[PDB]
């Protein structure tokens, strides 16, 4: 009764299925949505309001996250939650900042801690975590913003720290990603590079022996903002080039079928500020060595209308799964936009 | 590091590095008041007092921006700052600040 991937419920294009604005409607301040679905419920995490004030609270997903509606968890800034096939684990830090500290929540009682090693800041995904047959990944990094600041994969089991993975390769400078199953041998990330690249570190984690191998995307689609123009970065894949400076999260989702995997991505339709969003697909291939530009699919939000962090995640059904992405809306208290994937035809 | 220097009639505030994308530049004299900003997509603000009479452009290539006078008034006469103050919070970088002319 644990947490299995499976196939995708077949479809062809996203649909706009919901949006939670508090806004408009005691609501609270929320910032860095994120939801993750068990077997039979999806409940919408946020952080509420660096300070003390900084809690970890959860409504079910549907609902506004009013006073008496939001159970708090915890004291951090920097939050995640998944399920690992039975009950609830969440993960969030806080502290001082060059002496943060991991928490670790499980079922209801508080179970273990993990402590910063490159003393400047530590910080984890700002999403929901991915865990495969009782072990759940995580990805925390540790260093600073113009510098270095080196990741690490996390493997807990019950709410008990296993094993830490050390990537190999250009590991110079990665943070805040989400990550989805590609396969059951192969689990994949898509990370945020503020210093040096104007591109998204790709990761690859192997469940079976626990190795990591962080390379940049090859195609000319710049996801990142700010960019550049669109395969304006001359030379191999692992060029930095010009306007690496600045960084945002991105939207990431898988789609599983019987024997080829479709990857989803989204960026900001604007170069350099964040104004609305837009969704780019590719079907196949390898990302470490396809320079072949993304396949236009759609315009996500209006230029008119913000487009912040986003995020990448799945609802269960009961014999498939439908892979969903959201965005977060800011005006500071933010709404939610979820979009999954519907039907057939062309998005409208 | 990243320093920003004021040379300026013609302005020239060069700034190192790559902040010329990512930060928010204004123009401040001297109480504290604001005089000229512009973004990193090209909109352009500028103080009630100043309108239709400053003119700002930009150069992406070599990370220097110019600014330009026209119809000078006495009271004009002031020490003229460039900024580079980050309107993100999410963006880990400081404000930095200039000698000035």
């Known amino acids: 009764e644990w947490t299995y991937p499976r196939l995708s419920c077949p479809g062809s294009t996203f649909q706009k299925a919901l949006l939670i604005s508090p806004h408009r409607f005691a609501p609270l301040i929320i910032r860095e949505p994120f939801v993750a679905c068990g077997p039979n419920e999806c409940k919408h995490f946020a952080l509420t309001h660096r300070n003390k004030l900084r809690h970890l609270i959860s409504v079910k997903l549907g609902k506004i996250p009013t006073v008496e509606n939001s159970i708090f968890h915890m004291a951090a800034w920097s939050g995640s939650a998944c399920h690992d096939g039975k009950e609830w684990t969440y993960i969030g830090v806080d502290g001082p900042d060059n002496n943060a500290l991991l928490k670790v929540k499980y079922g209801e009682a508080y179970t273990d801690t993990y402590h910063s090693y490159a003393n400047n800041i530590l910080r984890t995904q700002e999403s929901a975590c991915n865990c495969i047959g009782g072990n759940c990944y995580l990805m925390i990094t540790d260093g600073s913003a113009s510098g270095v600041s080196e990741c690490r994969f996390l493997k807990i089991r019950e709410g008990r720290i296993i094993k830490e993975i050390f990537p190999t390769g250009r590991v110079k400078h990665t943070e805040e990603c989400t990550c989805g199953f590609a396969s059951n041998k192969t689990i994949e990330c898509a990370c945020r590079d503020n210093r040096y690249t104007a591109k998204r570190p790709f990761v690859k984690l192997n469940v079976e022996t626990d190795t990591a191998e962080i390379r940049l995307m090859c195609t000319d689609t710049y996801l990142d903002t700010p960019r550049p123009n669109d395969g304006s970065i001359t030379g191999p894949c692992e060029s930095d080039g010009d306007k690496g400076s600045g960084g945002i999260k991105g939207g990431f989702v898988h789609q599983r079928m019987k024997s080829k995997i479709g990857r989803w991505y989204s960026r900001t339709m604007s170069k350099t500020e964040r104004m609305g969003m837009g969704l780019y697909v590719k079907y196949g291939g390898d990302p470490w060595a396809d320079s072949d530009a993304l396949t236009f699919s759609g315009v996500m939000v209006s230029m008119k209308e913000p487009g912040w962090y986003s995020f990448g995640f799945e609802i269960k059904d009961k014999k498939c799964d439908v892979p969903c992405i959201g965005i977060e809306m800011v005006h500071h208290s933010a709404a939610t936009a979820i979009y999954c994937l519907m039907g057939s035809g062309q998005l409208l | 590091d990243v320093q920003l220097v004021e040379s300026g009639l013609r302005l020239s505030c060069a700034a190192s590095?790559?902040?010329?994308?990512?930060?928010?530049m204004g123009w401040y004299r001297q109480q504290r008041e604001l005089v000229a900003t512009?973004?990193?997509?090209?909109?352009?603000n500028y103080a009630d007092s100043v309108k239709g009479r400053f003119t700002i452009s930009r150069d992406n290539a070599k990370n220097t921006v110019y600014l330009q006078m026209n119809s000078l008034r006495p009271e004009d006469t002031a020490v003229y700052y460039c900024?580079?103050?980050?309107?993100?919070?999410?963006?880990?970088?400081?404000?930095?600040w200039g000698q000035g002319t």
């Open positions: 900024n580079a103050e980050s309107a993100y919070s999410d963006y880990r970088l400081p404000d930095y």
């Open positions: 590095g790559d902040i010329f994308s990512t930060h928010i």
């Open positions: 512009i973004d990193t997509d090209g909109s352009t």
